Design a binder for this molecule. Structure first.
Ligand code: SAM
Ligand code: SAM
Ligand code: ZN
Ligand code: ZN
Lengths: 387, 387
């Protein structure tokens, strides 16, 4: 019904409403542009890492845009294996592959259920897999992990952020076996929960799915994993499962990996100290991988400017990684700060960095008490220099 | 190589070593007789419950003994679907089905990978599924749950009892995400961990796998589940996940479902209070289901005498269900009891019942302190009446 261009690719897709949500359940969503940009860059990383032709998988292909962009915008794709259980998805995929002048022997199209497609006896493992489902990726995790080759990378997407973010706690518990926290850094909590789920599902088969990148935007999470083998690597991941105690009254938070160490009352104001998790308390970004994404993105004109700005902010953020973060407006609302300095400036007072999660959010190695102390200080010297 | 008879069935199987373990990794193991007896009785229960023809599945069939015994020893089996990825397993299966004069339209034989076999578009759900793998059943749980029909029953077996029982804690953590306890009731802890794993895997799809029967013998666990639907039923199951704090010094134990309530030191002697779980702290036996198994077993001459004795002991045990149990010899060794009365008699002093888990084990509603008090009393009045 409509032809659109994304990057180097041209595709035929059904017409799209005047406006769409970030997680719009449609055949093709242009608002997922950044997501697909990251996927392309992620594959190019693997290309530079392996230095050889790779086989990539697109189990939930829809229009086939990702597989196509992989073939056109990267250098090492030997063959792309795209799949979709939908018939017209198949038809549209066929026509899109031909529309982009892609040689037949460069790709395969399948109309199987994702898990069947992945668990096929290929005789080889996928170097790169992009899992982009409507809602939760849980039903496909195990099949993906098993189908992937050692050292391979998983490009993952999840749009069921509502349960993960604490809006639907019971739903979150059933699917991810964890208690979410609907706070100012709820999106990070959700991501860390998703990561924990992915790791434990793969851990069942002694497969180590190491998280190397995380990105949250509106109603979708974007994750990157690298598959490794060995029970010791799985163990090292499990050791990085933990809990987050959070206080809704004063926003105090602490990481707990020892079951004996839970506190009922918030040490600061004495309010209820809620428990989030279990979840991933490790690093959200691999410095090298993130840095590559940013540098490689700057070399590509077909990469969205937004993707580049996001990658710059995430690079800055990855150099000071913490569990949870602070939101300036929430802190200021707590201490009634006379004037709120721009977040770029505000972070300096806390020796911290900006976070992509929230506009006025920031990470810092300072303790909660130290942060509040900084707020009071800034508050006092602002009132003091105001006569 | 050898023909053997079990129940009403006659089968051809490769010759078996003079002696075998309970979990012997062989084509056919006669030591699993009791297990298959329970499976048959379990199916007959469903027959009496539904009152209609049912479709049963045997994803890991091997010799095809289970599917055959189902067809021959129950009344409601419409069609049996047996499967095995092994070629000679297939060949042997074919010949065994024909050997027992089973009509072709009464069964189907497949040579697919279990998950593929179960996830096939059958156009119907299985009323009864028997999962009997070498080692852990984890890799098949989700496929089984999805393939089963609402109200259907799962006949499950697990031979990886070593990790579940605490012999290999790190291995247990990777596969079941839980800390085992290598104590006197380690086998119950293992079963409860397995149950928790099964429930959470099915919970991912809003499927409620309710445990209705548990049996531990040597190096294998036997479980029965009934599939139900609705998020509320899944929630009620999740609420029954918990932890077991245990003390290796004095054998004190307590159930903890509240993360805030963990104790570092054993309240009795002050030694380290270890933590087992998370795991299933609910009932291990459905009274009605268990009672049927016992009564129906007594009507069948082709059912092992051992199976009948076990079912009688388990029926007795199911009327006083607790989390964990006590072992007389261990308690006596702690207080140095002059003479140990037979377990049948000993249980009376504690107002408890015998447990199938261990010969001299027993369950009781008395608190740990009360139990030890009983031991000292019995000890004193035994020494007192001894002049
Ligand atoms: C969220 S869309 C992904 C679109 C595409 N990956 C992109 O980036 O634009 C997911 C697609 O997977 C297909 N799908 C959903 N469930 C599936 C399943 N169980 N097996 C195979 N394909 C499935 C649907 O038809 C849907 O079009
Ligand atoms: C433990 S034996 C079960 C024997 C039989 N159920 C009984 O009670 O005597 C498991 C069988 O499943 C088969 N099997 C193992 N892995 C499989 C898989 N991934 N897919 C299909 N069959 C499998 C093996 O060939 C093996 O013979
Ligand atoms: Zn507080
Ligand atoms: Zn103690």
């Amino acid at each position: 019904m409509e032809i659109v261009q994304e990057g180097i690719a041209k595709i035929i897709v059904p017409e799209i409403p005047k406006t769409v949500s970030s997680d719009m359940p449609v055949f093709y969503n242009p608002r997922m542009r950044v997501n697909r940009d990251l996927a392309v860059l992620g594959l190019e990383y693997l290309c530079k890492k392996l230095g050889r032709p790779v086989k990539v998988a697109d189990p939930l292909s829809a229009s086939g845009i990702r597989a196509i962009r992989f073939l056109l915008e990267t250098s090492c794709v030997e063959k792309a294996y795209a799949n979709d259980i939908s018939s017209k998805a198949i038809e549209i995929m066929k026509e899109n592959f031909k529309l982009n002048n892609i040689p037949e022997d460069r790709y395969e199209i399948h109309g199987m259920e994702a898990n069947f497609f992945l668990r096929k006896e290929w005789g080889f493992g996928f170097d790169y897999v992009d899992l982009d489902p409507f809602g939760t990726p849980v039903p496909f995790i195990e099949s993906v992990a098993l189908s992937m080759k050692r050292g391979g990378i998983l490009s993952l997407t999840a749009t069921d952020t509502a349960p993960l973010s604490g809006t639907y706690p019971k739903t979150c518990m059933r699917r991810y076996m964890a208690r979410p926290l609907r706070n100012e850094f709820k999106h990070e909590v959700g991501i860390r929960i998703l990561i924990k789920k992915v790791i434990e599902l793969a851990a069942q088969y002694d497969i180590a799915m190491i998280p190397i990148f995380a990105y949250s935007h509106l109603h979708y999470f974007k994750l990157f994993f690298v598959k490794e083998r060995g029970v010791e690597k799985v163990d090292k991941l499990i050791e990085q499962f933990g809990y987050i105690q959070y206080c809704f009254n004063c926003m105090n938070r602490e990481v707990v990996t020892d079951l004996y160490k839970f506190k009922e009352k918030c040490p600061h104001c004495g309010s209820k100290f809620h428990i989030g998790g279990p979840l991933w308390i490790g690093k959200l970004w691999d410095e090298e991988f993130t840095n590559f994404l940013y540098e490689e993105a700057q070399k590509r004109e077909e990469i969205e400017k937004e993707t580049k700005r996001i990658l710059k902010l995430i690079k800055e953020e990855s150099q000071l990684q913490t569990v949870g973060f602070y939101v300036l407006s929430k802190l200021a609302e707590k201490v009634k700060l006379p004037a709120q300095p721009p977040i770029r400036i505000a972070v300096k007072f806390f020796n911290g960095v900006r976070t992509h999660f929230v506009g006025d959010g920031f990470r810092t190695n300072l303790s909660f008490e130290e942060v509040m102390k900084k707020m009071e200080e800034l508050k006092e010297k602002q009132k003091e220099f105001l006569e």
